[PDB]
Amino acid sequence: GHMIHKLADVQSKNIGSGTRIWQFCVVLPSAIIGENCNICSHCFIENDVKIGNNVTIKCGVQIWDGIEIEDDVFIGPNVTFTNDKYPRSKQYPKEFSKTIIKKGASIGANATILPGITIGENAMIGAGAIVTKDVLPHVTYYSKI
Amino acid sequence: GHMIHKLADVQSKNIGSGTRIWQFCVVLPSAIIGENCNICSHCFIENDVKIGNNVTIKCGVQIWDGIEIEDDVFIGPNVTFTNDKYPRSKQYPKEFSKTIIKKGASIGANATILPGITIGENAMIGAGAIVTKDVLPHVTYYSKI
Amino acid sequence: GHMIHKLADVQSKNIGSGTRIWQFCVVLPSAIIGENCNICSHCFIENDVKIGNNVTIKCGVQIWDGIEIEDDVFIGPNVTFTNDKYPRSKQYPKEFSKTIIKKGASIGANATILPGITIGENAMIGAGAIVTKDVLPHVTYYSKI
Numbered sequence: 223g224h225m226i227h228k229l230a231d232v233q234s235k236n237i238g239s240g241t242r243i244w245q246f247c248v249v250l251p252s253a254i255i256g257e258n259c260n261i262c263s264h265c266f267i268e269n270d271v272k273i274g275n276n277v278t279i280k281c282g283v284q285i286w287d288g289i290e291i292e293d294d295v296f297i298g299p300n301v302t303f304t305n306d307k308y309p310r311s312k313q314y315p316k317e318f319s320k321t322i323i324k325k326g327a328s329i330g331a332n333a334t335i336l337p338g339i340t341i342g343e344n345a346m347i348g349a350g351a352i353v354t355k356d357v358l359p360h361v362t363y364y365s366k367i
Numbered sequence: 368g369h370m371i372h373k374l375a376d377v378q379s380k381n382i383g384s385g386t387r388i389w390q391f392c393v394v395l396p397s398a399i400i401g402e403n404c405n406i407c408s409h410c411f412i413e414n415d416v417k418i419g420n421n422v423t424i425k426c427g428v429q430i431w432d433g434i435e436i437e438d439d440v441f442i443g444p445n446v447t448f449t450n451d452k453y454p455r456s457k458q459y460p461k462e463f464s465k466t467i468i469k470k471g472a473s474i475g476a477n478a479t480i481l482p483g484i485t486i487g488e489n490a491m492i493g494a495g496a497i498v499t500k501d502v503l504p505h506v507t508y509y510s511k512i
Numbered sequence: 513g514h515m516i517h518k519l520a521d522v523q524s525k526n527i528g529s530g531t532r533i534w535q536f537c538v539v540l541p542s543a544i545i546g547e548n549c550n551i552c553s554h555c556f557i558e559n560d561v562k563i564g565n566n567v568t569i570k571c572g573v574q575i576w577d578g579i580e581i582e583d584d585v586f587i588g589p590n591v592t593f594t595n596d597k598y599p600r601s602k603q604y605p606k607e608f609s610k611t612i613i614k615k616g617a618s619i620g621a622n623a624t625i626l627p628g629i630t631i632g633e634n635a636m637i638g639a640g641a642i643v644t645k646d647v648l649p650h651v652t653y654y655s656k657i
């Protein structure tokens with residue numbers, strides 16, 4: 223079985239064994255979430271979303287349509303994803319940009335990921351980074367101060 | 368009519384037709400929100416706040432006292448506004464700084480807007496930018512890495 | 513007495529007189545919170561956490577295990593703390609890194625604080641800063657654009 227907090231709104235049935243979804247989360251019906259994930263408080267997870275096994279999503283994260291998270295990924299608190307490069311209110315793209323966070327990668331707290339980004343297997347993104355280009359597998363990337 | 372989610376705390380009656388306010392939002396009594404807005408999950412909207420028509424506010428945004436959003440604005444997820452330049456706990460300003468986001472402007476995800484800022488009509492703020500100065504109409508501004 | 517909003521999940525009994533905890537907050541049982549604090553909507557406060565008196569925590573803040581906030585601190589909205597320098601999903605540190613925010617300090621909106629950080633008494637952190645090193649008492653630090 224899986225644990226959905228009474229104070230979460232989880233509409234998806236596609237949730238693996240051992241997954242925990244905490245207070246004040248929203249998960250829309252088509253989201254797929256694997257086994258032994260931890261979806262911490264105050265997250266939003268849209269429809270066209272795939273999340274693998276053993277994924278940690280810390281508080282305050284939104285996973286939009288077009289985002290895939292592979293197995294063993296860590297997403298730090300308040301990490302921000304995007305799916306529209308030139309957003310204008312009520313101008314809906316024909317297709318959302320796809321982001322994929324590959325197996326074992328980690329995204330530091332409060333990082334911002336631009337649309338269409340690939341972060342490679344076991345990469346490490348520094349806290350507060352802005353990721354405007356793909357990050358190669360096993361690379362440590364941060365936005366220098 | 369307008370749609371207020373049962374899991375939102377909306378205290379304002381000043382909400383235009385076609386507006387949607389989603390889960391875990393707080394809207395205080397004096398907030399004014401126009402028609403056909405989308406206030407996504409996990410937002411906070413204070414009292415001395417004016418929001419126009421056709422405004423998109425993505426998840427995780429707080430709109431403080433002193434902030435005005437004009438029509439057709441897009442506010443990306445986790446965009447942060449401010450109204451106190453030198454904040455000290457329990458030292459309440461006599462007047463909050465005013466921010467105005469002008470018609471059709473778009474603010475990228477996880478941008479930070481300092482107090483007293485004007486963002487001009489149809490401007491585009493890059494994801495993760497820090498906006499310390501006014502942005503002219505139709506200008507694309509981002510914080511270079 | 514103290515004020516816990518009906519839409520908060522506060523599990524701690526260790527809350528001082530005059531403290532307000534607002535909608536959609538989570539506070540875990542061992543958290544200690546002093547007198548006359550304001551914990552604004554959408555915050556998360558873990559177990560191994562000490563918060564002093566007269567502390568303002570604006571919306572969207574998570575205070576992790578290992579974080580201490582002293583008296584009279586201001587924490588701006590969406591300020592992000594961290595306690596694990598090299599996070600990997602399901603790889604739990606033997607010890608979390610400790611952060612201490614010293615008396616009267618202020619952290620600007622949407623700042624990111626790396627693990628193990630001391631911010632000195634009455635320091636001022638700019639909105640959107642990334643704090644990778646200790647900040648001396650009374651110093652104004654921001655990440656230049």
Ligand SMILES: CC(C)(COP(=O)(O)OP(=O)(O)OC[C@H]1O[C@@H](n2cnc3c(N)ncnc32)[C@H](O)[C@@H]1OP(=O)(O)O)[C@@H](O)C(=O)NCCC(=O)NCCSO
Nearest residue numbers: 298330331348349364365366367594595596597599642644
């Ligand atoms: C990026 C990193 C992994 C790198 O650590 P590291 O490789 O040991 O780098 P380092 O040796 O500490 O620092 C090297 C330099 O980069 C800077 N730096 C490190 N992290 C940075 C960041 N996130 N942004 C900007 N600069 C950074 C340091 O200030 C240092 O600068 P100087 O050489 O000028 O002193 C780490 O700092 C980090 O950001 N970790 C993520 C923490 C996090 O978000 N955890 C998840 C939340 S808690 O579970």
Ligand SMILES: CC(C)(COP(=O)(O)OP(=O)(O)OC[C@H]1O[C@@H](n2cnc3c(N)ncnc32)[C@H](O)[C@@H]1OP(=O)(O)O)[C@@H](O)C(=O)NCCC(=O)NCCSO
Nearest residue numbers: 304305306307309352354443475476493494509510511512
């Ligand atoms: C700012 C921008 C509109 C600009 O796109 P653009 O004008 O096509 O710029 P670009 O040609 O992609 O990039 C030009 C340079 O600026 C950099 N850049 C682009 N966006 C940046 C940002 N947000 N912060 C820092 N640098 C940025 C690129 O890395 C590139 O650098 P090099 O020239 O060194 O390669 C876009 O990158 C962006 O930030 N969009 C907002 C996305 C968003 O937040 N959407 C809302 C959430 S989803 O609805």
Ligand SMILES: CC(C)(COP(=O)(O)OP(=O)(O)OC[C@H]1O[C@@H](n2cnc3c(N)ncnc32)[C@H](O)[C@@H]1OP(=O)(O)O)[C@@H](O)C(=O)NCCC(=O)NCCSO
Nearest residue numbers: 449450451452454497499588620621638639654655656657
């Ligand atoms: C850091 C500061 C306290 C400094 O204000 P200040 O010392 O008067 O600096 P300033 O004179 O305005 O600006 C000096 C320079 O630093 C830059 N700057 C100021 N704040 C900055 C920030 N947060 N990040 C990057 N640059 C910043 C300015 O752009 C200016 O650059 P130029 O000299 O190139 O013009 C203020 O800008 C700030 O960040 N305040 C926090 C606001 C906040 O988060 N409030 C809490 C939420 S509302 O309660």
Ligand SMILES: Cc1cn([C@H]2C[C@H](O)[C@@H](COP(=O)(O)OP(=O)(O)O[C@H]3O[C@H](C)[C@H](O)[C@H](N)[C@H]3O)O2)c(=O)[nH]c1=O
Nearest residue numbers: 244245260262263278538595596599600602603604605
């Ligand atoms: C009890 C409870 C937990 N949670 C979430 C947030 C807690 O931080 C988290 C605890 O679960 P866990 O021990 O499996 O922690 P993880 O979420 O796996 O994160 C910890 O371990 C990582 C390796 C990193 O070091 C990270 N910084 C840590 O927080 O679960 C809620 O959101 N609400 C709750 O009520």
Ligand SMILES: Cc1cn([C@H]2C[C@H](O)[C@@H](COP(=O)(O)OP(=O)(O)O[C@H]3O[C@H](C)[C@H](O)[C@H](N)[C@H]3O)O2)c(=O)[nH]c1=O
Nearest residue numbers: 248305306309310312313314315389390405407408423
């Ligand atoms: C069903 C539901 C929706 N919502 C919010 C968040 C969803 O992303 C949003 C969907 O409404 P919508 O289709 O009108 O989307 P918008 O909010 O208008 O944003 C989309 O379109 C923009 C032009 C940009 O491309 C943006 N990146 C997109 O997300 O509504 C909730 O918060 N909770 C919910 O339960």
Ligand SMILES: Cc1cn([C@H]2C[C@H](O)[C@@H](COP(=O)(O)OP(=O)(O)O[C@H]3O[C@H](C)[C@H](O)[C@H](N)[C@H]3O)O2)c(=O)[nH]c1=O
Nearest residue numbers: 393450451454455457458459460534535550552553568
């Ligand atoms: C009524 C209500 C208030 N609150 C929180 C958020 C409101 O901003 C806050 C109001 O309490 P307060 O007047 O004691 O304000 P503070 O939280 O102390 O912050 C204000 O004063 C500071 C010195 C800075 O200038 C800051 N920018 C201001 O917002 O309480 C909720 O989260 N939900 C609510 O329903």
Ligand code: NA
Nearest residue numbers: 300445477590
């Ligand atoms: Na943020």
